[PDB]
Every structure is written in C-alpha cells, then in structure tokens.
Design a protein around this ligand. Sequence first.
Ligand SMILES: C[C@H](Cc1ccco1)C(=O)N[C@H](CC(=O)O)c1ccc2c(c1)OCO2
Length: 167
Amino acid sequence: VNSFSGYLKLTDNVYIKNADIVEEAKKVKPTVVVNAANVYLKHGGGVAGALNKATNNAMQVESDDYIATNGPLKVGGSCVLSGHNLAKHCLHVVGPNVNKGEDIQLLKSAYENFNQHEVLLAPLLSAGIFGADPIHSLRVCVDTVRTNVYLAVFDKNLYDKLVSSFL
Ligand SMILES: C[C@H](Cc1ccco1)C(=O)N[C@H](CC(=O)O)c1ccc2c(c1)OCO2
C-alpha cells in the first residue's frame, strides 16, 4: 500500500491521473519524482521548468554543479539527484526531443531508467514540449517499465484521450 490517490489503473504496474506533477509531488513526497530533463539539465520550461520553479531554483543550482563535474547526460540516459522539497530523489531522465530531431527509438531506453526504482511519480517522457506523441509515449511506458509508475498528466483533455484510446 502506498499514498497515491485518484489514479486509474492501466496495467498491473502502470497508473495514470490528470494532475499537475508539481502539486502531486508536494502532497505525496514520493520517494522518486521523474523530471523530463535535457542533456544539459537546463530546467527552463515544460515539466522541468515547473519542477525547478517549485524548488526556488535549487534544482538548477544542484544540476549546474552536476554538469560541471560530470558533463552532459546521454539522450536516453538519467541521473539521480535530490528531490528538494518535492520528493526524496529526482530521477532526471532525458527522452528524445523530436523538436531537435532525436531518434524516437531512444524513448524505450529512456523509460528503462525507471526500472531501477520500485515506485515513481512521473510524466510521460518526450511528451509536451519534447514533441513526441503522448499516446506512443504511453505505449512505450507500458511495454518497458516493470516497476510501479504513477503517471501525472497535466492536461485534462490529453488525459481523456490517452484513456479512451488505450489498448
Ligand atoms: C497535448 C498537450 C498540450 C498541453 C500542454 C499543456 C496543456 O495542454 C501536451 O502536450 N501535454 C503534455 C503531456 C501532459 O499533458 O502531461 C505536457 C507536457 C509537459 C507539460 C505540460 C503538458 O504542461 C506543463 O508541462
């Protein structure tokens, strides 16, 4: 038993809700919140900008030190950093950004990072400003992630669509 509420169950291990991931995180304090990161950990907009703003820019400060020490992430890769006031940990995961021409097949590799964590609150990778089809992203999520994932979808309209078209 865990503290997530109001989720619709899609599969044995995948759950979905129309919610703002920022407010969802401040209420659950999940062990892991996933950020829709880029390779530079520049949290300017989308989910990343919203999460970072909710940390009063502490996420960005920590991220800049990480990059200065380690260099950029790989597309499809991830790193674990602090969750600040939102979660114990933040798993920064880089899905491919279609608006940069990145290979969509890397979306499966990106979701594989979720399997290193027993339970996660997460957005749909490569959705939103990353330009992928959220329905394809949901399919890859369901077919790749084996751990327990709670997907927060900000847009109510999108959410209804994802549910109604789910196979
Ligand atoms: C089709 C809709 C358009 C839309 C955007 C906002 C409302 O509708 C869409 O791309 N949605 C994705 C996925 C989602 O809805 O979780 C998304 C991603 C990041 C976000 C985000 C929304 O909003 C805040 O950061």
